[PDB]
From a paper:
pmcCK2 is a ubiquitous and constitutively active protein kinase. It has a heterotetrameric quaternary structure, consisting of two catalytic subunits (α or α′) and two regulatory subunits (β).2 The α/α′ subunits carry out the phosphorylation of target proteins and peptide substrates, whereas the β subunits confer stability to the enzyme, control substrate specificity, and govern cellular localisation of the holoenzyme complex. CK2 acts as an anti-apoptotic protein and is seen to be overexpressed in a wide variety of cancerous tumours. One such alternative method is via the inhibition of the protein–protein interaction (PPI) between the α and β subunits of CK2; the PPI interface is not as well conserved among other kinases as the ATP active site hence its inhibition is considered a more selective approach.
Additionally, we considered keeping the Trp residue and stapling with Cys and homoCys (hC) residues using the linear sequences CRLYGKW (P7) and (hC)RLYGKW (P8) respectively with mild oxidative cyclisation conditions. Compared to P+, P8C9 showed a greater than 5 times increase in activity in our preliminary assay (ESI†), indicating that P8C9 can efficiently engage CK2α despite its reduced size. A comparison of the LEs (calculated as outlined in eqn (S1), ESI†) of the novel peptides with that of P+ indicates that P8C9 uses its structural features to target CK2α the most effectively with a LE of 0.101 vs. 0.057 for P+. Combination of the X-ray structures and IC50 values suggest that the homocysteine-cyclised peptide, P8C9, retains the binding conformation of the peptide more effectively than the cysteine-cyclised peptide, likely due to the flexibility provided by the extra carbon atom on the amino acid side chain (ESI†). The binding of P8C9 to CK2α was further assessed using ITC (ESI†) and its Kd was found to be 750 nM. X-ray crystallography was used to confirm the binding mode of P8C9. Comparison of the co-crystal structures of P8C9 and P+ in complex with CK2α indicates that the central binding sequence of the two peptides share the same binding conformation. The crystal structure of P8C9 suggests that functionalisation of the peptide may be possible through the N-terminus or the Lys residue as both are solvent exposed. P8C9 was found to exhibit similarly high potency to CAM7117 in enzymatic assays, as well as retaining the same binding conformation and displaying an increased stability compared to CAM7117. P8C9 is the smallest peptide CK2 binder to date displaying high serum stability.
Numbering used by the authors:
A (entry chain A): -28 to -22, -5 to 331
B (entry chain D): 95 to 103
The structure:
């Protein structure tokens, strides 16, 4: 198939944000061969678009069109992701990350890369996952099933973080589950990026309901721990049957919704610790809120999904301070997963 | 037949 081929500290002084670095996998990209990360210097070797015929539309997002297709050469189901107008730099970055992570635990497999010979519109070809939409599936999951699938996502995140890559869009729509087979794949690597210590990133990533506080307060020196906040938002929605869990009307309201649950004491401590300049639009709307006990979201319909271990694990993901959150490997060691670990 | 972004239905 198609592939790419080669051709904290001082900070700024008394003002500006305090620098941060990842607690784990900090320097892994610094020491790679340049070909691992240097996707601008690679060129695509295209496959044959004629191998694939469309079966049905799956995704109509703002930035792609996704179809189920069949590979007529070998008769296998695939998915085709047609990329809407977007940086060349952006498409080769998604390709490079997918190729770097290919074959890792629970990582979607990129099978081919093709383009329309007429319009030159590129498409990524993936293994097909026979997904059940989360708006149907999640309310049918047992307590064990939530633990099992959370562990599967953690295997994918520990793997990608260990490989120097932040996913930056963890959410139900980017987690495909073939529930008959207990088969989970983390998809959608089109916002994923290589982590470099000290680098300031764009905060316009993830999807509002899953955005970490660092994105909402414009703290740019973030790392893998962003994904762990997003995963905590997914866990809360699953065990409390409340989707999405933090339902903001906009990016500013999103932080208010979080602060009404986790309280403002730890939020203002976070802003002080990193010397974050809080957007003056928060003056009227944030205010001061008590921390709520995780126990207040429990009711007769969701109580079988909640345990002391679930609430302790959730509490250790949903921390304002990105440095305080469990890492993916530390999360996998949590008592919430003790039964999943013995089952492997 | 039909093609969409070059792919035959
Ligand atoms: N391999 C796949 N198997 C099944 N469905 C998929 C697959 N890849 C993508 N999809 C569907 O297409 C949607 C969009 O794909 P995604 O890669 O997330 O694109 P985008 O970056 O535009 O969000 C997904 O949310 C999912 O519903
Ligand atoms: Mg997506
Ligand atoms: Mg995407
Ligand atoms: Na368990």
């Amino acid at each position: 198939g198609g592939r790419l081929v080669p051709r904290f500290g001082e900070g700024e002084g008394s003002e500006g944000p305090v620098p941060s670095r990842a607690r784990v996998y900090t320097d892994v990209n610094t020491h790679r061969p340049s070909e691992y990360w240097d996707y601008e210097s690679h060129v695509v070797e295209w496959g044959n678009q004629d191998d694939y015929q469309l079966v049905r539309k799956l995704g109509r997002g703002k930035y792609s069109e996704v179809f189920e297709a069949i590979n007529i050469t070998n008769n296998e189901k695939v998915v085709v992701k047609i990329l809407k107008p977007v940086k060349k730099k952006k498409i080769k970055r998604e390709i490079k990350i997918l190729e770097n992570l290919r074959g890792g635990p629970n990582i979607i497999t990129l099978a081919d890369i093709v383009k329309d010979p007429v319009s030159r519109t590129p498409a990524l070809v993936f293994e097909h996952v026979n997904n059940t939409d989360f708006k149907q599936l999640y309310q049918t999951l047992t307590d064990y099933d939530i633990r099992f699938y959370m562990y599967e996502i953690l295997k994918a995140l520990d793997y990608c973080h260990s490989m120097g890559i932040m996913h930056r869009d963890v959410k139900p729509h980017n987690v495909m589950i073939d529930h008959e087979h207990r088969k989970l794949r983390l998809i959608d690597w089109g916002l994923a990026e290589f982590y470099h210590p000290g680098q300031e990133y764009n905060v316009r990533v993830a999807s509002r309901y899953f955005k970490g506080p660092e994105l909402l307060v414009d703290y740019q020196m973030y790392d893998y721990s962003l994904d762990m906040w997003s995963l905590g938002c997914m866990l809360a929605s699953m065990i409390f049957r409340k989707e999405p869990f933090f339902h903001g009307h906009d990016n500013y309201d999103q932080l208010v919704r979080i602060a009404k649950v986790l309280g403002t004491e730890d939020l203002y401590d976070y802003i002080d610790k990193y010397n974050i300049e809080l957007d003056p639009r928060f003056n009227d709307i944030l205010g001061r809120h008590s921390r709520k006990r995780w126990e207040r979201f429990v009711h007769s319909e969701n109580q079988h999904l909640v345990s002391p271990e679930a609430l302790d694990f959730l509490d250790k993901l949903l921390r304002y301070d990105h440095q305080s959150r469990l890492t993916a490997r530390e999360a996998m060691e949590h008592p919430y997963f003790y039964t999943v670990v013995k089952e492997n | 037949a039909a093609r969409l972004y070059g792919f035959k239905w």
